[PDB]
Design an enzyme around this catalytic site. Sequence first.
Site, PDB file in Angstrom:
ATOM      1  N   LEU A 125       0.704  -1.624  -0.052  1.00 49.15           N
ATOM      2  CA  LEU A 125      -0.309  -0.373   0.123  1.00 49.15           C
ATOM      3  C   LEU A 125       1.000   0.834   0.379  1.00 49.15           C
ATOM      4  O   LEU A 125       1.933   1.582  -0.318  1.00 49.15           O
ATOM      5  CB  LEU A 125      -1.072   0.058   1.241  1.00 49.15           C
ATOM      6  N   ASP A 126       0.443   2.566   0.294  1.00 48.03           N
ATOM      7  CA  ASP A 126       0.767   3.375   0.477  1.00 48.03           C
ATOM      8  C   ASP A 126       0.197   4.281   1.781  1.00 48.03           C
ATOM      9  O   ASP A 126      -0.308   3.548   2.253  1.00 48.03           O
ATOM     10  CB  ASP A 126       1.266   4.655  -0.425  1.00 48.03           C
ATOM     11  N   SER A 127       1.282   5.700   2.148  1.00 45.26           N
ATOM     12  CA  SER A 127       1.103   6.092   3.254  1.00 45.26           C
ATOM     13  C   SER A 127       0.143   7.031   3.472  1.00 45.26           C
ATOM     14  O   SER A 127      -1.034   6.626   4.062  1.00 45.26           O
ATOM     15  CB  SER A 127       2.029   7.307   3.650  1.00 45.26           C
TER      16      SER A 127
END
Lengths: 128, 122, 177, 155, 65, 87, 99, 79, 459
Positions: free
Chosen positions: F41-43
């Site tokens: 995922l991403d931040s």
Amino acid sequence: SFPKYEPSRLASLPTTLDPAEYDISSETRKAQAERLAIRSRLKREYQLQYNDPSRRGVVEDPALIRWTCARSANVYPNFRPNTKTSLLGALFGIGPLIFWYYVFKTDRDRKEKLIQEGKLDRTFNISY
Amino acid sequence: GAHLARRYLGDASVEPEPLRMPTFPPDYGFPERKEREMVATQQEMNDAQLVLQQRDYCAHYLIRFLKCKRDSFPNFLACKHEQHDWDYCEHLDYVKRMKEFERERRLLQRKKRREQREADMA
Amino acid sequence: AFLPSAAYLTHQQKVLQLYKRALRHLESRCVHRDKYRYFACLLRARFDEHKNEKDMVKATQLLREAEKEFWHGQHPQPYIFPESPGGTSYERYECYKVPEWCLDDWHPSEKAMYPDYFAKREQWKKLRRESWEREVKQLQEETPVGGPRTEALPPARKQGDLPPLWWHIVTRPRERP
Amino acid sequence: ITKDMLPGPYPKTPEERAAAAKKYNMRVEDYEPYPDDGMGYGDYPKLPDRSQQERDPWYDWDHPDLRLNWGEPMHWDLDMYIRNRVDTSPTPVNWNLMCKHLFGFVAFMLFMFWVGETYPTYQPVGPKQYPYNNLYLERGGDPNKEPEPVVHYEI
Amino acid sequence: AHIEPRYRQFPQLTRSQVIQAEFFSATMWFWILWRFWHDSDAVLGHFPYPDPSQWTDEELGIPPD
Amino acid sequence: DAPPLTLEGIKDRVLYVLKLYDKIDPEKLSVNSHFMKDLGLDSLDQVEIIMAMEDEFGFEIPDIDAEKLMCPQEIVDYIADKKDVYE
Amino acid sequence: SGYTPDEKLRLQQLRELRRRWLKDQELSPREPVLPPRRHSIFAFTHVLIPVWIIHYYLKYHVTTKPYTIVEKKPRIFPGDTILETGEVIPPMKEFPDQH
Amino acid sequence: SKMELPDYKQWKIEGTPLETVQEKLAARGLRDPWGRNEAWRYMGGFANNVSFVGALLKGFKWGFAAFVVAVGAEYYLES
Amino acid sequence: MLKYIIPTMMLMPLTWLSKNSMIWINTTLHSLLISLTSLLLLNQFGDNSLNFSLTFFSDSLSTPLLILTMWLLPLMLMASQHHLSKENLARKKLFISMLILLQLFLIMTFTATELIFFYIMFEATLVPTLIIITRWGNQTERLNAGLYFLFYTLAGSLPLLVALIYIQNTMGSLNFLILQYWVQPMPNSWSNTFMWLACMMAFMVKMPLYGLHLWLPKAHVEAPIAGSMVLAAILLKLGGYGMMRITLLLNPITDFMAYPFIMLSLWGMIMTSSICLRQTDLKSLIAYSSVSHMALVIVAILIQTPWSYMGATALMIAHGLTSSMLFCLANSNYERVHSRTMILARGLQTLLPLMAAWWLLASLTNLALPPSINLIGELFVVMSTFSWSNITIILMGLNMVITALYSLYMLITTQRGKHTHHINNILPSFTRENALMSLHMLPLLLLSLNPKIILGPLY
Ligand SMILES: *C(=O)CCCCCCCCCCCCC
């Protein structure tokens, strides 16, 4: 474009709009590290003497006593009579006294002059 | 509400003000004008304890309505005829008041016409 | 700029906080859910356009301009959750949060109504006074000289002992007593 | 508590400033005392003059209501800047803009109310007529004195 | 019994509350319609308003000059 | 009013709202599934996940604790701590 | 980056301690150990007795003093009858009817 | 004590305005990854909501019927 | 008046021959008996005062003060028996003897018909008060407070003695009844101006007047609890009583000579009230509130109208009761938390509910809530000052805000909010403290039912 936000006395500048937050110099890092170290030392002392099961009473705070002594018992030895203090004391000490004395003297002189000449309405005035 | 605009945006020489009225004698232009006559004597209307504002020229139907309201308790919804008579009489009095306002306005208009005619003639 | 774990806030943390507050304010302006989804995806695209930026001063300038944008585009009264600070019912039940040491001042007549609870309280106090000196002796030998540089606390290192300074974080009153 | 913990006079030499900053638990370059104008402030620091509402509402304080920490040098007007009192938190719009808008709205409303008072609104009707000499006896007039008889004619 | 809390779906309703709500709404509308049928004058007007322009000069007693 | 919560109930809640995410395959994630490590995922996606948590349980998680929750079990533990579950 | 493993260990230990404390907060069925210890009388004690008491008070201690209870005199209309002396008030003048 | 949830696969965005906004984002070259989270809001008993005019005239039919029978009864009982 | 002096002076063998464990019980019992005996002074007549002999008399002004004093002594005995529990027995007996001597001096000061006897015991009240303040005060500043109090009083009141001897040599007598029937008008001269100043300045200092009040926020703070009761509840009222007595002879110069002093109170009761908005100390807050209330009393006396005189009497009695109760509450908090600062102990309603109820009721009676006699006195002074001049109502009305603005403030930071975490020695309220609060408050609310016994001699 967008209106720039300026600070006031009763409306300070936001933290996110402060340029000094974005300064990433090493001196600022040292300053924040020293501030965090001081805060951690004080917090450690407070919660070391606060979590003690033997202690029953008040965890006294030297900052509170320092503040009370500065607010009450340290005002006079650090006072020096100069032009600013004397003018502020004369302006705010005997100014309103003279003003209210003149106002009340004028009103009561006018009222007595009207009363003794039979001009003021004093028909049902029997409670004074 | 065009009279307000006529007085405020036009001129006030013709439009009558409501502060003091009338500025004309009632016998001017009215030969044998008869006055309004009350039905209620002051004693019986004094004993009825009417409001001084309500002590107007049409207090007879007011007294009738109050007697109906006092006599029909607790049936509080069947005195509509008497109050209809009362506010009909008050409507007639309001009609008389606006008739007097129009009479004052027309007399002031005649004054303006006569004074401009006499100024131009001489 | 005021944290118990770190001395300062990094650039990525500032960007993430800005994204959080901007999305919250946009949700406040865009009450209906589908409209909020449209403009939230638009804001996500606008944040993803400058994601792969390597010049630090350009990223900082973009951050400052985005802060100016957000401050121009605030809701005058944004949505606050009821228990968050500034909310409608923030710190409402703090009158009901009586500390547990008041139970030490209870009369024996009213202490007799709860025998098992006060037996458990006695054994809890016994555990605390048994572990307190172990906790403080762990505290002296763990931190370096000159005082701790951070407010973070060590856990229970050995076996059979408790983490240091645990009593006022375990016996804290419930949210709805 | 010992006598060297209380506040003292205004520091002038740098070593007294260093000892004062050590006393108040703050950095030497962060410690700025009040100016020596003889107003009794002494060596108490001049804090950045912000209310307690501006502090972090999520960081765990030693005093959660006051948003304050044990041992921190408190402000000279902390009894003024508590959350029950005057706040200095930033506003969405500018202070001068707020003052100008409020003063303009109040002045415009006052002027318009004066204009409306000078120019009233009425109805095209004559004055209300009451019988019995405008209710002379009912208005508190004495019956012994005879008033001028006025009368209203029909139209 | 009591109403159990549902999850992401329309909650359970008693017949009594919806019956009473519909009854009181119908009562309000019946009251409004009945009072407009009977009175019909407090909204539209009570008495005719004679405009001043149609009054003759004889009844106002205006002298012709 | 205010029905009681439970640990398996709140775990079911966080998983149930997690499989409704189009960036997450529901047949892979578990209760110890890291976002940028095990799920990629991403931040910003973690920020959106935390906002979904706030909008699901009705209380706002502070940012300094939102930057630390990295697995569904960590969110379960944080909600359990903040709501005082299993008395 | 989330927690350090050190912080994770601290949070786990504090969480299990907190859960033990909250489990100990419950009540055993014997607790609390409490020690062992007329249909419409509200209309009698709270209504009728105050009516009796203050009717006695008003009739025998308030109205015996002058001007304590002053009542507006009853309204008088044209057409009714007076109980106190018995005069029939004369009726009013004939209406010049508008309708 | 025990809570049971519906199926997570039943929420679909088709027919709802979430489908419209997803198609608009696709036309703009974007996507909405959270439509299924609030697909429950526009599906079920929370769909097909009345408008202002529908909510204002709630119960108007029964009230009008009551007014009709009442005015008929007042007509008949007078004569 | 011999029926009250003799038992008061026999209280000293009672407290000096008692056992080491029953001094408090015996002293409280017999002082309560004397307080019950005190009710026989209510035999007041609508024309004549109650004259006992050539030496003592009591009209309707001195009677509420006498009843308040002899009711107040047992309250001090019950309050001051916890911080003296570990004290030596001989010093305990000396403290009780100081209290007994102070009461004896006060109750024969309020009844002296002759003015120099009034002055002699009005200054004999200095010695036990000063001894109590400088002996059983806690901190270092009790000595400076005692010096300030003693020297302000004496330096203000020696010209009063000179003027009184001049009156005795000129008029020929100092009896108050003879002076009531032999009073001559005072003409306009500088000698009469300084005569007025010498007669007034002693009571100006003891009232206190604004600008001469600097001895109040010291002596009301460093003193113990019983010292606080006498300092706030009798001695200020003693100065007011002396002012009422001696303003008879100073007519009609007062009609202009009171012109500055009224302003010195009319503005003064503003400023000191504002001080209570920014006070970090609870006892100092109560002391400055006392300054403001007594300044209002000063204005009421100086305008010399009947309504102002009855308002001054009711205000003096009510303020004495309320200030004593507030000092008791502050002393209880100081005993529990061992510090006097207001912000240290917060949120005490969660721990001490009934003491919070007493705090609320005392604060409500402080801000002149009707129909309490505080509001009656404040209202009557307001009516009289409105009759004096119109703009004075502004100086009243603003005060009517600021008073509440500190009183409820005093209610909040001591009782409302989140409690202090590290303070864990908040014991439950004793029966003694609650009994003290009830004995302070219930007479005040009962006096709200029949206020005509405290409305002065011209009611
Ligand atoms: C002239 O118009 C006389 C009436 C009074 C003044 C004008 C009032 C206008 C506002 C009220 C009427 C609104 C109609 C929609």
